[PDB]
Amino acid sequence: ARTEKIYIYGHGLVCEDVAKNMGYKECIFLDFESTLPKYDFFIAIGNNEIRKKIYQKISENGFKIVNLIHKSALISPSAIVEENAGILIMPYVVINAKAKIEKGVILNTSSVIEHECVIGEFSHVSVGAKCAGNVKIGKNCFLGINSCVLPNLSLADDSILGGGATLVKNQDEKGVFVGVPAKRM
Amino acid sequence: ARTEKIYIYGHGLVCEDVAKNMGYKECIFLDFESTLPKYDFFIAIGNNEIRKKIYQKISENGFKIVNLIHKSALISPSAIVEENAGILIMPYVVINAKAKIEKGVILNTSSVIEHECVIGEFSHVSVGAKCAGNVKIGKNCFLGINSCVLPNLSLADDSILGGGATLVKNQDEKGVFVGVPAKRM
Amino acid sequence: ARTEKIYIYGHGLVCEDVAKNMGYKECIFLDFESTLPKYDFFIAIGNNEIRKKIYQKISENGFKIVNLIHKSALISPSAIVEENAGILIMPYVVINAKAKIEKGVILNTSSVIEHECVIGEFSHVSVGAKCAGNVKIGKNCFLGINSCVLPNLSLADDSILGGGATLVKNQDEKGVFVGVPAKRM
Numbered sequence A, B, C: 001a002r003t004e005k006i007y008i009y010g011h012g013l014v015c016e017d018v019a020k021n022m023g024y025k026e027c028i029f030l031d032f033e034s035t036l037p038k039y040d041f042f043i044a045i046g047n048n049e050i051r052k053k054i055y056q057k058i059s060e061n062g063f064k065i066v067n068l069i070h071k072s073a074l075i076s077p078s079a080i081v082e083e084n085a086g087i088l089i090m091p092y093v094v095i096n097a098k099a100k101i102e103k104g105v106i107l108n109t110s111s112v113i114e115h116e117c118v119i120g121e122f123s124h125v126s127v128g129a130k131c132a133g134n135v136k137i138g139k140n141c142f143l144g145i146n147s148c149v150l151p152n153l154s155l156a157d158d159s160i161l162g163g164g165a166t167l168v169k170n171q172d173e174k175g176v177f178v179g180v181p182a183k184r185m
């Protein structure tokens, strides 16, 4: 049962707006804490490795690491969002039927996760990024602003998809995949 | 007057979420049916030619083929959405003043149809795709994920616009228009 | 205190839908007016220089030039939207923590303004365009449909970012920056 207050470990303020939107009445920023009263906890760190290590430590200190899910995000009843798993879901995100979102994932504003996708733990899906149906995003991946991945593709663990970039082919090996930069005329 | 149940002919589950969102209480999947009770009917087939042939046959069997329009889609009062025409409108779609959407069209999640557009019958507008003002999309067109068409342009019947692609010029002849694939670095 | 009617100077109809959505009961299109009853006023002109000159003149005739902000736009409590400044905010726009939107700006449908951005006066942010965190958009800029600007960048006054284009580097000089056109295959 969500507490009335939340510990939140730029991004802080943004996670705070999401927490207020959910109906948290007060947010406490942190930057031995096991002696504090056990309010719900959230880790507002954009970086995949720090999010993970802090997640593991806060968990070991006896806190519940909740999910922050903006009220305007739409999640299919048959989708699976791992419960109390530090998952950030921003405004206007849409997650379709039977998709699965794992622990520590960030789904930023307007991203879309089509039917039957799996978004692996601690991945980062940026603003406007889109994953078509049955896409598998490995753990610790980053999908850039306004990027997208075509249907039925897999992106291996620790990969990076650039701003504006469109993934068209399976990748079972780690990699860095770029789009086109705007050009001065 | 919409029935309490709906026949729906991955995509099924997704159309089912849209139907539940509208307030349908039960969805019946189909994959002689004229002897069945006449609930509302919807065709959850992504493919433009099958959607059409099944549409025509179901119509000839005496069913009403309804539109499924998610409650979060925003449609200008002066826009025209052909009534009971098998049109799928997904979450967060925006259709602006005096636009016209014809029979059998799919408007997927977050697509936007600006003022005075015409989206011709059985076309498919994918997730995040955008049509600027006064754009004419012919019948049986496909606009890829995160694509877009600049203002005042026409795309001829049976054309295809790739993922991520930006249409910049009129096309009065059928064609296939591609964007840039992400490149491994 | 907003009046029940509004003067609105394609785009007219669209601004009218936004005004009705806010709860204006009647819109009056204009295309000596100081002798008219002082309803709220809005300038529905897409062009940055005309918007400005008309803004200045209408202001000098004693009208209040209001902001039109669709109810579905989400604005952080710590964001600053200049009050009664002719700012158009369209459906599903998201403006994050501590961002600042200046006078005469257009934020079109689904654009996103991340934390700590500044969007300078009379700029135009098109449908689906996205500005990442701490981005500074100068005055009279235009950001094309589905474009985007990476984090921590500045775009100098009077610049243009094309449809589909992704800005990757600081620009302290005025310029024109293009994306890739779809190519017939």
Ligand SMILES: O=C(O)c1cc(-c2ccco2)n[nH]1
Pocket (backbone or CB within 6 Å): A074, A075, A076, A077, A094, A095, A096, A097, B014, B017, B018, B021, B091
């Ligand atoms: O959980 C809800 O409130 C909800 C979810 C949806 C939906 C999710 C995907 C398509 O529609 N529609 N409503």
Ligand SMILES: O=C(O)c1cc(-c2ccco2)n[nH]1
Pocket (backbone or CB within 6 Å): A108, A125, A126, A127, A143, A144, A145, A161, A162, A163, A164, C132, C133, C150, C151
């Ligand atoms: O929305 C976000 O978290 C985000 C993603 C990016 C980015 C950097 C390079 C490509 O996209 N910058 N900010």
Ligand SMILES: O=C(O)c1cc(-c2ccco2)n[nH]1
Pocket (backbone or CB within 6 Å): B074, B075, B076, B077, B094, B095, B096, B097, C014, C017, C018, C021, C091
């Ligand atoms: O029909 C409605 O409920 C509605 C539609 C809109 C709108 C449509 C386009 C811009 O605003 N705003 N509200």
Ligand SMILES: O=C(O)c1cc(-c2ccco2)n[nH]1
Pocket (backbone or CB within 6 Å): A132, A133, A150, A151, B108, B125, B126, B127, B143, B144, B145, B161, B162, B163, B164
């Ligand atoms: O949202 C959809 O229906 C969709 C569109 C696509 C696609 C395939 C190639 C370019 O976009 N894949 N899925």
Ligand SMILES: O=C(O)c1cc(-c2ccco2)n[nH]1
Pocket (backbone or CB within 6 Å): A014, A017, A018, A021, A091, C074, C075, C076, C077, C094, C095, C096, C097
């Ligand atoms: O002002 C509101 O009603 C509101 C704003 C937000 C928000 C803004 C950015 C992220 O969440 N969430 N709710």
Ligand SMILES: O=C(O)c1cc(-c2ccco2)n[nH]1
Pocket (backbone or CB within 6 Å): B132, B133, B150, B151, C108, C125, C126, C127, C143, C144, C145, C161, C162, C163, C164
């Ligand atoms: O949404 C709008 O106001 C808009 C922007 C554009 C455009 C023209 C070239 C690149 O984007 N066309 N319409």
